[PDB]
């Protein structure tokens, strides 16, 4: 009577998102889906309690089971250490996981037809994917950067700058071909999965050789694994330059992968091998909202990013398992969310995008529990019907 | 009769901006201001003709007279060489001038109330300083990339491994920065904050590049304490280093009204600020507007935006005034800046602004004036505004 989801690593979070997260599982996921769930408590007091072990433990779990969905979690500073009496200034969980998993991060804003987009439109969303020794130079003299190949066949030495002025500062950066390659695979697969064109954008004219190598190693992997599958879906890859991008793009239908309100932005880390994926929101814990919540005040916090974390995650578990039932479900919910907002029912943040904050009458939007309630109602219906 | 302006270095540019600059002069400056005008014609023909000499001179002039106003100039490339049979693909004027005067470039966007902004929280303006010359090359296969510092005083050289490539090849690059260059950045930066009475913010990835951005933060504080804290507190402003992630946070959540030191185009104003805090060069941040200019050539109606260009004149003129204690000029410059904003805030604008409000597809002709009409309306409100302050 319920769907078999399968293996999902979930990660609990902090403050206001910890609440929405629970609200989602309760009203939107568990009433409908059975999962073999590898839950990991990543909330600040638990991370401290276990010496950030829970984090490493979770990351390994995702590596194992391919699918991870993550609630937003407190990264620590002074005030935090002071607040929870933390033993240490724990390294961002995103950082720790990203480190054990690799891959490249894709960021997509969810588009609602009644919600202002920067460009008037933009019917379909653009999907953005983003991609050293430094020292002091006491006084004058040459800083040269020099390359000797393994076989000692040559030696190239380029001068970085000659200091006759005084001292300064200097640095050296590198980048292996492998990493560029992983960036490419991920970039093309992303374009495949979402059946959309891919673009690349570089300096290329300034940092010629560096950004050149990117142009190249993309082309090559395209022309030897992807030129084929791509046109098998009437969909291209192409290069371009940053300002010529923003050119034909800020006058575009939108809806392509481009390689280089917060409640609506969705990040996803897509690993090299295409099989492993972690989804989360792009926003934080929404502390301001949670302080209010604590104070007994009413809140209007956008659960969409967090929802899409779930769906995109579930979507990818379905894909892997070859699970048409589940696949349908994830999609069905992604629909209901956009549907419900387009229907006019929405949280305060969205309402502000439409009317501007000074203009928002309480009856223009719904509070956190009201909006979550409404999606619950609309999901229940939409599923009952089709 | 007219206000005595003083020494001002004028540079004339190309294409649409050339047409507009002549209108700004004719209609808005000259009628009210006499000026000891060192003009230099930075047209492309003339730059060609004189063997980019006129450029150099203009820079040298600005050096000597402290105040410049630049019209947008063509930067050549292959296509341009053909169009103009150029003797040579001459370097970017700004490039030439900036490498003679030094200092720090500063963009401020001009904000009208009726113009959908980037963030509606930004009710007051945000001014951004930016600091290029990095050597980069391709590792074809395995080997070591090392970066070596040999002191000029004969002390043992110092070698850092940048990466030892075993599995494959890749890319590499050195980057550098002189103390002088950073000192300059800091000064220019504190100069401009005091100038504009707004507070100053430096951002870095200092945590991540301990030594490289470490130097900046330091050099900035060390300069800030040694000679600006006094003047800063004695004006209710402050300096402060921050990290980029904190810095965009506070920015996106702010009221605007601050200068930030960082390591629509007809409303963007570029200002080169020399460290001495005595020389300034003003210019619109946009280019020569060929697209519009070729429309103008073929007899068609244009609606190009003069504000950017006008503010070149006004910061230049304003700085001149401030230098010379010219209370009369000072007023005028402001008076004109306001009239600008005002006129647009009154509905009278160019097509590009009209499309900021009504959406590019929904822009009807009656929403906006064309270049020449709008330029007149500026002329009209200026006269009127000026007549009122008397
Ligand atoms: N683990 C993770 O993935 C991340 C964690 N964080 C953590 O978040 C904590 C504090 O977050 P902070 O950086 O202050 O800001 P957040 O990114 O948490 O959100 C700050 C502001 O953005 C708006 N906002 C963001 N998300 C939503 C939403 N879903 N619905 C409605 N409004 C939203 C609200 O604006 P308004 O005030 O106008 O209502 C909110 O006050 C920090 O401790 C940080 O470490 C941050 C980012 C990612
Ligand atoms: N000397 C200088 O400081 C600079 C010079 N240039 C030079 O300009 C030439 C061509 O410039 P280009 O690349 O077209 O860049 P431009 O800055 O001239 O502008 C390109 C587009 O931006 C919009 N735009 C810019 N300024 C205005 C304005 N004042 N009013 C209305 N719309 C505006 C127009 O778009 P739309 O067509 O949609 O109206 C315009 O076609 C080159 O040779 C280049 O080197 C460029 C930048 C700076
Ligand atoms: C405005 N502008 C430039 O500055 C430019 C190139 C440049 C500038 C300074 C320098 O030191 N080297 C190169 N081209 C255009 S247009």
From Swiss-Prot, chain A:
Compartments where found: Cytoplasm, Cytosol; Peroxisome
Domain of life (superkingdom): Eukaryota
SUPFAM superfamilies, alphabetized: Isocitrate/Isopropylmalate dehydrogenase-like
Cofactors, names only: Mg(2+); Mn(2+)
Any GO CC annotation of this UniProt entry: ficolin-1-rich granule lumen
Residues at which Mn(2+) binds: 243
Swiss-Prot/TrEMBL catalytic activity: D-threo-isocitrate + NADP(+) = 2-oxoglutarate + CO2 + NADPH
Residues that bind substrate: 75, 92-98, 107, 130, 203
Pfam families, A to Z: Iso_dh
EC number of the protein: 1.1.1.42
Cofactor notes: Binds 1 Mg(2+) or Mn(2+) ion per subunit.
Modified residues (N6-succinyllysine): 124, 374
Residues modified as Phosphotyrosine: 40
PTM (free text): Acetylation at Lys-348 dramatically reduces catalytic activity.
Residue list for modification N6-acetyllysine: 79, 215, 224, 234, 295
Chief location category: cytoplasm
Subunit structure: Homodimer.
Family membership noted in the UniProt record: Belongs to the isocitrate and isopropylmalate dehydrogenases family.
Stated name of the protein: Isocitrate dehydrogenase [NADP] cytoplasmic
Organism encoding this protein: Homo sapiens
